[PDB]
């Protein structure tokens, strides 16, 4: 049951569709959040320039800084994905 | 208490780190506020740009400046702090 809810986002709609698409893949395949995170983060570096950062978690709050138009916070079912670009 | 599970910072800094996340964890009840605290501190102390995650359940994958990384447990809360940009 992987339904996507984008809570907060500063990216282009096209790029946030990929964030979702890539994260869906990642969730299905891998069992460890760190591995889903690593996958998303690597796919984003390659396809979209370094440097990206990813968090995949069930309980976390974050305070981060990011490049304009390179941020997204969303849910895939019950799990929260933080993806953004800095440096 | 402060079970540092991984660190790339100087010993000093890991302290300044642990201590501040203590202040922050004392003063605040919402993770975002704790993270925000720590994060804004470090920006003001060690220059921008720092990022901070505080959660009980999260996997991460991030890229950091040499000597500006730390992931640790404080009680049952995980605290990832690091510089990049």
């Amino acid at each position: 049951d992987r339904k996507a809810v984008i809570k907060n986002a500063d990216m282009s709609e096209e790029m946030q569709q990929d964030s979702v698409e890539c994260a869906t893949q990642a969730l299905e395949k891998y069992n460890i959040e760190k591995d889903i995170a690593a996958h998303i983060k690597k796919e984003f570096d390659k396809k979209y320039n370094p440097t990206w950062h990813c968090i995949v978690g069930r309980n976390f709050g974050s305070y981060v800084t990011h490049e304009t138009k390179h941020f997204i916070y969303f849910y895939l079912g019950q799990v929260a994905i933080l993806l953004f670009k800095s440096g | 208490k402060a079970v540092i599970k991984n660190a790339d910072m100087s010993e000093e800094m890991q302290q300044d780190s642990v201590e501040c996340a203590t202040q922050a964890l004392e003063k605040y009840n919402i993770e975002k506020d704790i993270a925000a605290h720590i994060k804004k501190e470090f920006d003001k102390k060690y220059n921008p740009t720092w990022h901070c995650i505080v959660g009980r359940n999260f996997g991460s994958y991030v890229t950091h400046e040499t000597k500006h990384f730390i992931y640790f447990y404080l009680g049952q809360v995980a605290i990832l702090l690091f510089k990049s940009g």
């Binding site: 309980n59 304009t68 929260a80 | -």
Partner: peptide, 10 residues
């Protein structure tokens, strides 16, 4: 422009 801080909470 460039850089914006942002906070999240599950």
């Amino acid at each position: 422009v460039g850089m914006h801080s942002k906070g999240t909470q599950t």
